[PDB]
From a paper:
Insulysin (EC 3.4.24.56; also referred to as insulin-degrading enzyme or IDE) is a zinc metallopeptidase in the M16 family that has been extensively studied because of its role in cellular insulin degradation and amyloid beta peptide catabolism. IDE exists predominantly as a dimer in equilibrium with tetramers and to a lesser extent monomers. It is unique among the enzymes comprising the zinc metallopeptidase M16 family in that it exhibits allosteric kinetic behavior with substrate peptides increasing its activity. Crystal structures of human IDE (hIDE) complexed with peptides show that the enzyme consists of four structurally related domains that adopt a clamshell-like structure enclosing a large central chamber.
Numbering used by the authors:
A (entry chain A), B (entry chain A): 42 to 965, 978 to 1011
Write the structure that this text describes.
Amino acid sequence: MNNPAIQRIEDHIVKSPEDKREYRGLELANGIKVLLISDPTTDKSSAALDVHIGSLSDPPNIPGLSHFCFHMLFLGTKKYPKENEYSQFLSEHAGSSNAFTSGEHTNYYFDVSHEHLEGALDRFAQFFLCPLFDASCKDREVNAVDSEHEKNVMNDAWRLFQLEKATGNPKHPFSKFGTGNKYTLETRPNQEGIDVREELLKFHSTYYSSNLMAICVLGRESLDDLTNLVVKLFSEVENKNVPLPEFPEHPFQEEHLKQLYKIVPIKDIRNLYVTFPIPDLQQYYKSNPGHYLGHLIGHEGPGSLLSELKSKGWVNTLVGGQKEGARGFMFFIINVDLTEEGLLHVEDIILHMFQYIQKLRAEGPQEWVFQECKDLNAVAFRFKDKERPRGYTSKIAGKLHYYPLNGVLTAEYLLEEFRPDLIDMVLDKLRPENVRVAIVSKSFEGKTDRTEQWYGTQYKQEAIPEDVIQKWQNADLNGKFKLPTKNEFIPTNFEILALEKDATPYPALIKDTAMSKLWFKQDDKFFLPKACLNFEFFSPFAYVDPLHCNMAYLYLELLKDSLNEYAYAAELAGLSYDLQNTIYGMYLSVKGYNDKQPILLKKITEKMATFEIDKKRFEIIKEAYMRSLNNFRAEQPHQHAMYYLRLLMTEVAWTKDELKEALDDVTLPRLKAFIPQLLSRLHIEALLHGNITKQAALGVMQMVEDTLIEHAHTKPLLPSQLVRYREVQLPDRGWFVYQRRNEVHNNCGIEIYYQTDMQSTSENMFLELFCQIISEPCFNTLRTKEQLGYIVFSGPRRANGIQGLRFIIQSEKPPHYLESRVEAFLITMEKAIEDMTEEAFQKHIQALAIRRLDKPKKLSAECAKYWGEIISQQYNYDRDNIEVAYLKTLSKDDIIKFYKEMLAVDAPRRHKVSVHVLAREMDSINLSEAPPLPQPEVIHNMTEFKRGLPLFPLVKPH
Amino acid sequence: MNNPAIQRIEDHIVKSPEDKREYRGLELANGIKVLLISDPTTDKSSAALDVHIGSLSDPPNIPGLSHFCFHMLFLGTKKYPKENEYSQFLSEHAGSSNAFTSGEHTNYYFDVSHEHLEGALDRFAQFFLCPLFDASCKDREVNAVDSEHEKNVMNDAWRLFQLEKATGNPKHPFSKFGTGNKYTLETRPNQEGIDVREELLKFHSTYYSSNLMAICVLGRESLDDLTNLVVKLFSEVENKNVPLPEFPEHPFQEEHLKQLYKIVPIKDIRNLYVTFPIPDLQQYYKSNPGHYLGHLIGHEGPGSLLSELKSKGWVNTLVGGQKEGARGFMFFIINVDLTEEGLLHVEDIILHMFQYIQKLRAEGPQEWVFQECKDLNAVAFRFKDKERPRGYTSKIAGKLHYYPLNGVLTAEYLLEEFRPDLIDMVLDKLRPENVRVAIVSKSFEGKTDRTEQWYGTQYKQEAIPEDVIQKWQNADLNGKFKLPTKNEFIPTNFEILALEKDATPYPALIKDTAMSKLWFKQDDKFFLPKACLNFEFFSPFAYVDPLHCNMAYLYLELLKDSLNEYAYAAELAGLSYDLQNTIYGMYLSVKGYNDKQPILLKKITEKMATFEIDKKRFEIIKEAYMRSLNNFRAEQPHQHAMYYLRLLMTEVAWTKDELKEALDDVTLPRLKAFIPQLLSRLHIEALLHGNITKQAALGVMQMVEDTLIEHAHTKPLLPSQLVRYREVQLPDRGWFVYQRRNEVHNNCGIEIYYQTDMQSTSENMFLELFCQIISEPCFNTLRTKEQLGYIVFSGPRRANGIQGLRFIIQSEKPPHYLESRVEAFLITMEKAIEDMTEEAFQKHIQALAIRRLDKPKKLSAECAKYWGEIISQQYNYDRDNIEVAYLKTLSKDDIIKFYKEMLAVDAPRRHKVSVHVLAREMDSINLSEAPPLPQPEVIHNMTEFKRGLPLFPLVKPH
């Protein structure tokens, strides 16, 4: 009795009781799996379509056709032939989109203003009904794919990824190159024949079948309405009845086992990768054997494996468990980072891994553990934070291929059966004869034979001698490896306290004293048994010079290091904390189930105020920290540009250079002395937010104070004597440039900042609307036409109460060229604005309003927003409504004037600075015309530079 | 054979061999004693006339007629009848003048541009040949005299002065009121008859006689030329053959002896004054018995009297020796400040004084001591720094009454005969039966019977019981009081090192390293065996908050406190040091004979780096420091205005309030810990200047470094990471006012700052020429016509690289009135400038040039100038020539424009701030017309105030 397009309906979708959203499952006649989500309060709607095809179905001759294809798909359709029609519609209706290819999945998704779902879906749908696939872009698009590849070329992580693929069976599709590039996309085709337009079309026509598609749609409309909408748009997708691809033989045969790889990294890291091929455990999701083992093998603290490897001073971090492969196969991995001593004991490290394993075989599957995991995940599922719509549908579309409708939400969180047998089964694969091991370290440089062909990775491939393998099999049992004990942090009070009648819509200041300032809000919307605790400890000794910055950093690193064992239980129990230094002191945050928060907070604070430094932990943390500062050189060029702009524009900021130099003056005695000093006098500013009462907030706040006062003898640092840092003020019509060499990448980085004025409602909305207007053109113009790089960003920059427009580009071209192109873009944008219809303008106003008003979905999102107002000392909690009201009154002329005053080449108040991060070797047409530009004043000393310019005031508190 | 006007010539004037100046003594026929000084290199000339009449010859009915008289004398003459002709001539020719009355002397002096000596002297001379004495000023002048009196009314020092006079014989002129006021000057005359115009004339005509006058004149002209000039101008002064006044009976008879006075102070101090009347020792200057005793009784360190009084924790400072009275009598005094414990032991304190005395009688005069004093003073005289001309002639004119021509220079420095007899003679007066004692302390408040009539001082007068007197006579001998030992610091190497051929005209940077920056110049002009050593130690821990400011202060106070005994010898030996904290760290300066500098510097630095705090010294220094912060409330209203402006305009500055509050958190352990921290990391910037070689400078600099590094383990604070403070930047057209209560004075204070722009050659000379032009009008208008107060100041203000115009007034009127009057003055000045002749303008340019170019006369003057360039990090050593060159190119129009841009009510870039320090009770006509003014923005929080305004850059180094 269902509509002819629908085979089967619903299933009753099993969801969390807390979840007010309404759900319905569907199976279209044409084989499409579908989940509809009705949320009547949602500000943005969203949809995702996932194709169960990826780079694994890439033809042998054209690797990356899959990736290439989704690039081409966005590029206009028969009904909507404009090349950027999709994205421009999304931009102009508060929307955004993205897409991705993995081995077996291609996932396309977007969100949009809830009032225009139908129109966003009609367009998205066309991509699966009639793509133009025209060759005017086929040639450009390749550039974007190429630089995409290029950017990741020097990225270690990606290099290792594609290196585990070539270290495997070449006649297995796993070995194929997923990303693609210009070398195998435009080029190999002409010089070997073959039309990459015809090839695309074939692929798209063999593999783009409805039987292999899943869709998820979220909107305000009712389920019935969404049903019709979906049926109408998607029911006529073409079914090709493609058998689902499968890879059951497994990419790593006995020949690839017992292998060892010495890889040379770009960054100066030391990592060890251990890998056991395993059969596909997908079908077993109701019991999850691979992650019961992952849970014990990647466990931390008391008696765990990592604990031991840490005590030998061999390893700092351990991650272990099951890893995706493709339908038919998986892997079980165990990764660790090596200390200096660790790198000399790889063999002995691994022996310990098999020793813990062996201990598992000895001990055998344990029901109480699985039972514990079961109960945590259940609560975790019930009390899951409400997700952002765009990320939810995308995740759901993917999961639709693996589970029945009624179980698409609960799958992967809820366990059921306990299965000792399945667990033993996987356990049996973890043996020396199944092991692939990979060491990454710069100590191999110059002495590698092989070049992985796509990324260029140096590396050695060798076989692990029999005796070694034999030693590992001779893995007996190390007494130390104990199992985890019952989890004390598992919460049992999920009572949601009633809303105090004195409650308020924004955080209220409930305590203003010389020692502490406490902001507090009781949750009035999410009603989950969760609380966010935020503390900012102020002390001048944290950032007073580079030596104390270093000491502040090491202190917390050392503190966290020794709390870890104890803290892991909490984390598994959905209770986490963060602790880091800042230019003002230290930041302590605790999030999660509120029930046992007070016990964790007590332990952290106690340890803070009574800490005692293990000599040995000290040198390791320091050597790591040391190596980490050096490692900054390896970062992306754009990441460097941003780092230097931040230093440049701040009255006081210590560069990594300065920190490195000062690090060698840090000894154990010095550090021991510095702690009491740091803790000697303090001011604390706090936000406590969530499922807590006023009484409970003050109580939590007292215990922090009292624990410090009694144990470290802390006394009050009056707020009035806390020195805050100002932003540097650029001179009218000035242009400064700071130029630096990057010594790894053959790409250059660039950040251009046009500083405007002190933050305020009007200045804020001028900058933000102007940015909205240019957000998609910047993308469509500088990236999708001019192909200047994979990274092309524009938008607002905020810091120290000041703001301005920034552009960020990573590119093969020289900075001065990017620079000229950006100015060229600025002119076009100005004309574009002069020549834009009023109603297009209003859509831009309306689009920015929607983004701004879009309410946080979860506590930590609402919390972070408020914490932003505290950090910045503006305390403007009602900001969003105010600014949007003001936004709605702007007119084209206002934005034009704004532009002419602040941003034009000829602006009387242009304030421009550029950071140019030069490539390794570098350096020092129909296109629109760039204006002539001034000669930059060149910065050779950030300090001299700042000393010679005035400083901004600080922003007045709201 | 001498000119008929000259009785006797010269004497051959005994002078220092080092002294290139030429001298000649004279005795005019009319009894005038005269010294001429020819200095052909002098930039400014000078003269002084001293009359041997003072407030002691004041008629009984009109006290202060003497003071009054010299006010009236400046007020125009028959030949030069313009009321301010004298001072306006001096202003317009790089000159300045002043005058003063004491008991037996009235001293008038001026300096002037060397090119216009004759014209300045002609006018000065008229005052002693034919004063108009007109009654149009007689009525105004009284105001200035009155506020003069009023200002000192709340000044403790003056109150005690006039209180020792009324505690004496009323029929002795000593008891008369010296200052005068409106109460006894305009008033008592009408209501008791008597013309204060006729009275003046009488006085002036009985006492203003040539026989009682001495003159001293310094100019470029030759001695012969000065002779004629003087004879011509002064030979016809009228001789009245007044017998020289004398007061031989003595103001304090046996009735006033054995007295005790409990005085209530304005400031919260504790002081004890012990006073022995003695006969006049003037005649005995060749042997100076009073100051051989002063030398031993006011000695400090090893075995001295003060040492003991300090160990009992009774007293911090001791000053002892002979004190001026008047021809016929003197006093020998011994003053100390009391700790809290001291005030409870006055009796026991004094007993110790007589015990030391008794020890002197026991021991008897010692030839070696007098011999030591003799030799020090001789070297001191030979190597005396060349004096500023204005202060030299004034001093010499005074000394001309007491010594023969040929000995006027050497008198009071050179000893001759040793006279055990004279010493014993004075020693015999120091006995309990001769003693007057005075205690000053707020602990007496409310319980005094008597009001000294002129100042209003509360106080009790009582007689010292017999037994007390008896106890003091029963002053035996305290073992501890040892004599001073031979003086090891007495220098013996006065060799002037040859001028290295690599020498330079300005300090050169000879050492730029992470630990130290060393500026060095070898003396190329004074050639005295003297050196100035200046060290600025930078550490952020000195001023990081109020607690560390306090600790930095106490540290140095404690350090100096324990070095004193050791240092006194040096000081007597012409070798001194200064040591104080700053917002950047600490300042150590050492000046004097270079020979033993290195031994003193070594001891100071050593002690700095190894200091150990006596518990007991600690509480005393702290209680004193504490009391001292409270005592700021007692300061002059104008002094408060200046203090608050400095806080207001500096990015970071800790108020005395903040320091007081933070002081109670300072304990001994805390302080002990803070020292190593402070010394932990340091940067040093030095100026070494004088009679030292490059090799000797570096050597001196190394020993400071090496002594710190080896003993406190100091390591380098890189200069680049030293945070310097900026000046606050006022907004265009802004007017801010900070208003505060003064709780002691019935006068209000005011400072008005019109901030201009960052310092630079042009901005500097605009402000400085404008100031020159208005310097005398401001005086003549706001003070001498409008009589707004005794304190009326205007001129340049420099701080943190910024500058502006300031006016400072202390007044009976309310701030808003002064404020209006000042603006009224500004308008007049503008018109005055528009309407001033070109050649009058040029004289102003020429007058400022002369002041600026006028070369330093001594090492520490040249040193201080250079140290100014270092402190301020501008290093503009050739400043003076540059700025004057630029000065000479300015025109009226430039100054007008300057004024219209920056200073007018209507200036588009006026930047005005006013500090108003209100009187105790207060508050919150032909006159020129004040313009309407804006409503001030009012400051209630210096901090909020600064946070809301931008900050200036720092000035670029030259």
